[PDB]
Structure formats: C-alpha cells, structure tokens
DNA sequence: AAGTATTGATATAAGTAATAGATAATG
DNA sequence: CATTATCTACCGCAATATCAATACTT
C-alpha cells in the first residue's frame, strides 16, 4: 500500500550523479513476472531485502507492494535523493537509512556490530532464501565497484559469508557486454572470465534494442529479455542500461593464483598460447611446453580459452616448482633512487 | 713529479670501459678454469664472459643478414616479411660499431639499469631500450671523433635508438642462462634447474600496462655483492690531474671526455643560444669562475674514512648507514574470508615493507659504492671539474663522489693544501664547530665560548671515535663535526695554536640568498634589516621570527581543542618553519609546503604518522604570517609572473605568410629568455611533450620526440621564471666572488649559497664576497630586465577578447570588413598578423617615400599601437600589442651599507 | 576495387572516494 | 558553471595491446 512515485516527482529532483532509473510500472511488473522470485523463495513473507543505491525507490515500492516482505532496508547517500525518499516514505513500514554503500566499513557497522539488518547464514548448496540484494550501479564512473563485488563473490568475504545470495543489478550496457561475453567474442575480458568462474548470469532487460548484437545470439534467445525504450528512463542523456541477475555458484580452485595467472596470461589476448607463456615467469614457456601434452591447446589464444582451461593452467602453475611469488607483483611509485 | 705520475693513471682511468670490461672478466675465466668449478662472484664475471661469448654469434648473424639484405635496391620486392622490412629501418646503423663492443655495451647497460623505474627486480623496457641505444650512439660518437682525429643522421632518431635497444636486449634475453635451486610441492623434493636470466613481462598500476624486464634472484644475489664495482666500472670519477680550463663549450672539463657547459636536458634552443654566446665571447667571466671552482684540490680524510669503514663492516644500523638485511619480513597473511578493508590494509602493509626494504638496499649499495671510490682514492689528491645548468648554478662532473653529496661525502673530503691558522684560524675553526651544531643566532664570541665549553668532549670524540661517549653523533653534520673535532684535538695538543697546518674547509653561508636578493632588488629596509643586510649587533633570524608568528597563529587556532594545535603549540621549530619559508619566498605551493613540513616533522612523531591534515593548518598559519611579513618580494615576483603570462600568450609576426591553420589559435612557441649579468643566456626549457607508441621487437614503447617543435607550457613558464631569475642572480654573484677569490689566490669551492675555504682566509673571502655582491647589485637589475624584454620582444602581439559594444571595437569590425575586400577573401586574425608584418617590412625599406606610404597604411594592430587606453578599458577576439607592465616602485636603500655588516655570511 | 598500411580510438585494474587548500584552464 | 587536474627550483621517473575507421597505393 506504499505510494508509487510519479514522473512529475522524478522530474523535480535536481542531481542524479549519472544514475539513471527506469520508471515505468508496467515494465517493472513485466520484469518481476519474468523474474518470478516467489519460485526461489517459497516464503517471501518473512524475507528481508536490502537495496544499494535505491534512488527513486519505484522498484522498492513495487517489490514491497507485490511481495509484502518482513523488513526492507534502503542505503542511499546522495543528499537530494535521500530527502526525496525520506519525505515520500514517511509513516510506512518500509525503512530508509542514510549510509554510503561504497565503504566496506558501512556494511561492517550495519550488519556486524550495530545490527540494524541481521541476515541469516545458509549452506553453500542452495541459494539463500532469506536474503535478497538488489543494487543500482548505473553510474558510469563506478564499474570498479561491480568488479570489487565480483572479487567478493570469489573471496566469500564481503556479504557472501551468508552463503549464496542472488543479486539484481541495474548497471550499464557496455559493462554488461563486457561481463556477459563468451569465448572468442571481441568483448571478452577479465570481467567475463570472473563472471564465468564465480557466478551464472542472465540478462533480464535492456534499454536499446540496437545493442543486442554485441551479446551472444544463443544466450539472448535463451534469456528473452524485456526490451524497452529510452523514454522509460528519466535521464535520457546517459548511455543505455541493462538489468542482470547474479547467482553465486560453487568453485574449486585457489582464487589468488587463478587471479594472477589469468591476469598475466590474458594481457596478450590475441597471441597464440605457444608464445604468451614466457611472461608468466622465467622458463615458463619451457615448463608449460613440457607439461602440456595436448597440441590443440597450444594454438588457442587466451581470448578463446574458458574458465576450465584457465583452472587447468592454474593447476599446472601451482605444480610448477620454480614459480615466481604472486605477492611481489606490483610497482612502487614511492621508491625512486633519482641520484644526482 | 706528482703531476706526471697522476697523468698516467688518469689516462688509464679514462680508458674505455668497454675495452677494460672485455679484458677484465676474460681474465676471470682463466682462474675459474684453473681453480675449479664454482659459482662465486668471480664466476659471476665468468658468467658475464660466457654470455658475451654466446651472444656475439647472434649479433654477427644479424649483421650478416642486414648486410646481405641491404645489397639489393628494390624495396617493393625485398623484405616482404614484416621483420625484414624493419631491417631496412635499422641495419645501416648497426654495421658501424664493433659487434663485440656492442655486446659488452648491452650487457653493462642491462646490469647498470637493474632495480630502476619502480620495478622490484628489474627495469622498464622503454628505459632499457632507449638507454642501450643512447649508450651505443655515444660510443659511436666517441669512436668517430677519435678516428677522425687520428686520420686528420648526425643525431640518431629516438625511434631508431629504441629499435636497436630492443633488438639487442631481446637477443641477449634469448641467450642469458642461470641456474636456480628449488623444491617441488608434489613430493617436497629438492631439485635443480637452469632458467633464462631475463624474462620480459608486464605489470599493472591504476589500469595501465608497464612493459618491465625482470632479472633473476640468483643474479641479484651476486649483483648485490661488493664486487659490483669490479663487474661494472664507473665512467666519470674524480680526477687527479688539473682539469683543462673552460674556454670552449665543446672542449673542457675532463681531459678525454667532452661535456657541455650547460646541462641542456631536452631542448635545442638553449644549446643554440649558449653556442651563440660562446662564439660572441660574452661569458669569459663565467669561464673564469668555473675554472676557479674546478681548480682546487681535495683529498680523502683518512681517519674519518677508517671510522666509516669500521662502522660499515660492523653491519649495524648507524646514523645514516641503513645496515645489512638479507630477506624481507612480511606479516602473516590474513584469512581469505576476512573483510576487503582488512585485505587492503594488509596489501598496503606489504607494499610499505617492500618499499622500505628496497630503499634500504639502495642506500646500502650507494654507500658501499661511495666507500669503494674513497678507498680507491685514499691519500691521493682529487679534482672536481664543474659544469653548469641552464639556470646558471654550478655542479660537478662526478655524480658519485662529490662535496655536494650527503654528510658522509662531505666529511670524507678535505683540502689537499694546508695553510697556517694564524691569529684567527683557531677562532674560525671554533666558529665552524659551533655552526655544525645548529646554533647560529648567537654571535661569534658566544660561538667561541660554546666551542670552548666542550674541549673534554672534543678530546674524547677524537681520541676514540667509537667505544666512548660519541659526542659527534649528536650533531646536525656528524662526519664533518668528527673531522673538526679531530683537528681541534690536534691543535689543543700543541702549545702554540697558530702554527698548526690544517685541511678542514670552513662553512660560510648566506641564509636565504634568495631573500637577500629580494631585499636588495626591492630596496626594502624592513626585509634588509630582517635578513641582516643592515649591520647589527647580533644575527637576526627571519626563520625564528616567522616561527614565533606561526606559534602565535597556532595559539589563536588551538581554541578548537585540536590535538595537533595542542601538541605543536610549544613544538613549532626553526627547522620546520625555515624549510617552509625558504621555498615559500621562492614560490612554493600549498601542497609543496605541506610535503616539506610533514617530511621534516615526521621523525619527531609528536603528532600522528598521517600529519598531512595537521600540516595543512600549519602551512595555512605560515602563509598567513608571511603575507603580512613580506610585500616587496611578493610585488617583484608578481611583476615577473605578469611578464611571464604576457610573453607566453604572445605570437611573433614572422610565424608564416598566411597562418598555421591548426585550429582557431596558432600554437604558442614563445619562451621567457634574458641574459645574466655575466652574459650567459638563460632560456626556460619548459615545453609540451607528445608521446607516441613506437613499435619495437619486444613491445611498443611509449616515448616522445624531443627534437620535434612543441608548444610552451604556460603554467611551467609562470612557475619557473621567478626562481630561475633569482637563482641565476645568486649563481652569478657566486661566480664573480669565486673569480675574485681565485685571483687573490685563495682555495675556493662552493655549494650554491655556502662558500668554502680555509679558516685563515675566511676574512679575506668575506670581504671579497661583500665587494662582489655590491659590484653586481649596484645596477637596477629589475629595470635592466625590463629593457631586455622590451628589446627582445618588441615585435610581439598578444591575443584576447574584447567587448562587442566598444566604440573602438566597431572600428575593428569595419577594418576586418575592410581587410576582407582588400585581401579578396574572408578576414582572419592571421590575415591581420600578415598585414601588420608587411607594414613593418615597409618600414624596413630605406626609401623614405615607402616609409610614409607604409605609415599611411592602416592595420588592425597598427590601430592598437596608436591607441593607449583600450587595454585599460578591457565578445570578439582582438590583437593587442605586447605591453609589459611597469616595474614596481623601488624603495630607497643604499646598497653599499652592507659592507660594514658582520653577519651577512655566517 | 580491393588490398593495405596508416591513423585513431578504446579497454586494461579494481579503494588514491588518501584535500577546499587554492585555482587556471577546460568543454 | 561545474569540472579537472595541479601543485618552488634543479640535480641522468611515471602505459600498452587491440580493434575499428579511413585513406593510400596498387
Ligand atoms: O635520500 C633521498 C635521496 O637520496 C633519493 N632521492 C629522491 N629524490 C631525489 C632527487 O630528486 N634528487 C636526488 N639527488 N636524490 C633523490 O631518495 C631518497 C628519498 O628518501 P627520503 O624519504 O628521505 O626523501 P623524500 O623523497 O621522501 O623527500 P624529498 O626528497 O622530497 O625531500
């Protein structure tokens, strides 16, 4: 029974900091019907949901109206947006909080010690049915936050100590094309490799139908996203956005060594693998030639490799006796002899 | 017979490093094959020899391929391969030099470049390739000059240099081999294996690839050793024979090594102007001053050298010696499930530990190198040829061992010539010892009393440097204080002080010579009396006064309960405030002053480690005090800044005929230039750099082209003109003082503001320096600079906007419309410039009839030069003539009054 | 017209969100 | 009008691989 805000109230807001929000209730209803979150959470009445960068709050209001959760929390730091949300959602069971989701200390303070929001830990076999995290990172200058959250998927530390929690992400289309890539595509990168290793993602919505060529044809015809137009997002100046669903999966490898080997191996992403190995360390070319019995893997560029081949190469890297230490891999700008 | 004996050694010490290195480790192979199979650092030299002997065939094969490919002359059908295409690019260059020399040059450069460029265990590949190419081209130049003298492009492009460097570095990488020992983690079995010594790789920093070369830990294990001096020999080192005096900019300094008078880093305009000045002959005084600076003899302090050697061989962490450590101490890794903030903190700690460890290793290696040079030059007399930088200040040609180094290098140096103390030598040695202990506000008698108070401590610290009270350690200049204590112990052993022959230079310095020049130029009584230009009873400390003012400001601001204010209310010090003020008067920024004050107060640790926040408010207080304290210097530097802006935002009228057409605004190529009172031309080198990805064998480096003509960095010109002018005046005064002292026969050497000589001749030197300051500053240098700029930049036009509604502006609009029909096309500011240029060319015609007709012609700028109020009145773009501002008014203060001052230099 | 080399543009990593202090450029 | 790096002077340091468009020769 929460009041859904309108386009006239959205237009009143002045600063958006590059964040763009979808405001069409019909499109939101279609998106929620496609998601069918009641299927995963058999009892969403007791479910508790947290929102990162809520903004307009249309999605929060529609979610609460449709599902009636137990305790709903919002974390917004933008000033004008905070006053808008606070003014609108007065006298309602929905909660509003003023904290910046960028700082890890904010999460630590919220969950660990102050304990306003207390999720429950589940096993790693199935998705946590009592914790849902929805975030909006549509801002153009904050892709590093998304990459850090994926690294947190890998490290099982930030918010995933509670188990496998589903993520709904409003986030730009360019990073979506990079992240949802497949082997051989020109947009393949460490974003895509990390996504493949640590989670499974399905595209749910898109802002411009022209951008669907960048994605994979089989993947898009499987997902069947809900295509809309640039009108339904209020700030039209920005680039088209996309909605993705992130589900953590089980992984069996050493994250640090896999990270090092992928990052150093895939720099020369369009070089045959029989040449790119010598940059892993001294004698790496000879060692990997000796330990790689397959002659079909020695002519595939790192862009064409998949997470399974990368894990296999990580295993060989660990079995290497003479491996360079991965901790001493950086450049120090503070140190400079600079003798006269 | 000392000169002839040292002459042979210098010719030996000037031997080609490539030839000696070829013979050196070739010899080391003979003992290895006789003694037995080992891997000691003599076998490191053996490994270098093996690398050379296996690399030479590859270079020979490459030369053969290039020679065979260049034989034909049809480029279309030749070199269809990409590799064979670049052979036409580089091959005609490699065939000049001996391949063996080339190989040894590559190996030596790669060894020298290690642990440089921010890489933990290697060097950036761009630096490596360009440095190898530069070394090869320098060897080529030396060989060419020598063979031309014997028999009785000119500048290598940086792209070709990088290509050659990359080719040779890769070809050495493919050859270098070293053996490493390790265990495998399947069975924990210790095994051995050989690996290539170098491995090219990439790294990241804030999202950017860095092509880095990596040197094996086994190699580093020996490259850290004290045999680094044997494996790699310096090219420039202190001389034993008298240097050739400065006459021609292309011939001087070293007997066999050519050097330029100026250290022109990356600009040819400074070189051209210096060459023009040298050809004209206006810098004979500069030549004389440099000869005087570089003709004095030095020798190593044997006793202090012995003490330093014992302390270094002990291995413990001394005052400035870092010590000896073999492996890093990294804290235990946190659990992988810990918070990302904790993980980031741990990674920051690891980076800090690696930084500290690398810096300590570098300090230890540099100190070992310095002590090796000192031991190799023990007892003998050593000479320091001196070069000059563009801004006019003097520097030696020995970067490793020189008196401009740290306290160790200064204390290890004394004058080879000795002079009797005389009536004032003991007094001035005592003054010098008092100076070395941080007390200066006290007069000369009080300094003598302070020195006389501690004879027992001097005797202890001299009879036994270590294993005692060690009073010399608690001195601001420990090693120099130790040498001074030695000499006072010697003189107090004698019953007659005035008969001792001494070698210790005495420090005489002028506190903030830049502030002295400010006060002198502005004629400010307040600044002069604060800086002790006016004679007084006791020295006055501008640093102490401004520090008291900052204490007052912090007392005022401490009412906010600030912890930093509470702590530093009684802890604001002369040193911190002096390091802030000396640069501030020079024109430092807020962040620069913050850096300096935080660096100076960080060892005190009275506040937290992150004292930047506190030092922000401290610097605010310092600036608040200085704004009220100094006004004449501020006005002078503002006039310099306004002149810099006007010169930078100006276009000459001889740029072209029509236009550059590169955008609306033609590029700015005007740099601030003037002439020092000794005739030397000073040119600001600041310009923009255009870096392009240059493909090489290893990778595509990211380098610029200094030979390309680029615009001028206006911000850098503004920031550089005032300090460059001030320090040029300071160095000119130093050069004149040195020339006069050398004429009088003294032993003179100096480090910028401070001047060095024996204690007996200090009074004569002081009189000479007062006289030379008076002689140099008798003229109004600010005014003379104004006429110099007026004469140099008379035919210049600015660029600026103007109001559309200005009555004169509509006249400019019509003249633009008038010019369009006269030219026949659309009018432009460039067309206006061309019309102004041709009008000045008309005035150049000696025909009087053409002059009056030329005067009859009207140009847009010609309208402005007739006008005299449009600039003050100030849309549309307009052309304004270059009108430099009026000089600030000069106060009344007699220059010569400082001749009676006593604490001008002390 | 069809190759083909040149020239330009873009992503990389993953807390410098580690300063209002003060400011001259930018589009 | 907010942004956007930017910060005394010197005295031997701050990026690279890939992909798309375009124009140039053949
Ligand atoms: O001790 C110094 C010094 O030996 C060396 N170093 C760093 N920069 C320069 C330089 O520009 N010119 C010369 N001749 N030597 C240089 O590195 C050491 C740096 O350690 P510090 O922490 O003591 O110096 P820091 O850079 O932090 O302060 P500062 O050099 O700006 O004053």
Numbering used by the authors:
A (entry chain B): 2 to 341
B (entry chain A): 407 to 558, 589 to 1310, 1320 to 1351
Please share excerpts from the published article on this structure.
Mitochondria recruit a single-subunit RNAP and one or two auxiliary factors to initiate transcription.
The downstream cleft starts opening in IC3 and continues to open further in IC4; the positions of y-mtRNAP and Mtf1 in IC4 align with those in PmIC. As the RNA–DNA hybrid grows in size from IC2 to IC3 to IC4, the template nucleotides from −4 to −1 are increasingly scrunched. This template scrunching is highest in IC4 among the three states, yet IC4 is substantially less abortive, suggesting that template scrunching is not the primary contributor to the dissociation of 2- and 3-nt RNAs. Notably, the NT strand scrunches in IC2 and IC3 into tight loops and relaxes in IC4. In IC4, the NT strand (+1 to +4) has a poor density and no noteworthy interactions with protein atoms. The NT strand in IC4 carries less stress energy and favours RNA extension over abortive synthesis. Notably, the 4-bp RNA–DNA duplex in IC4 is in a half-translocated state; that is, the 3′ end of the nascent RNA has moved by about 3.5 Å at the C1′ position from the N site but has not reached the P site. No stable PmIC or other intermediate state was observed coexisting in the IC4 cryo-EM sample.
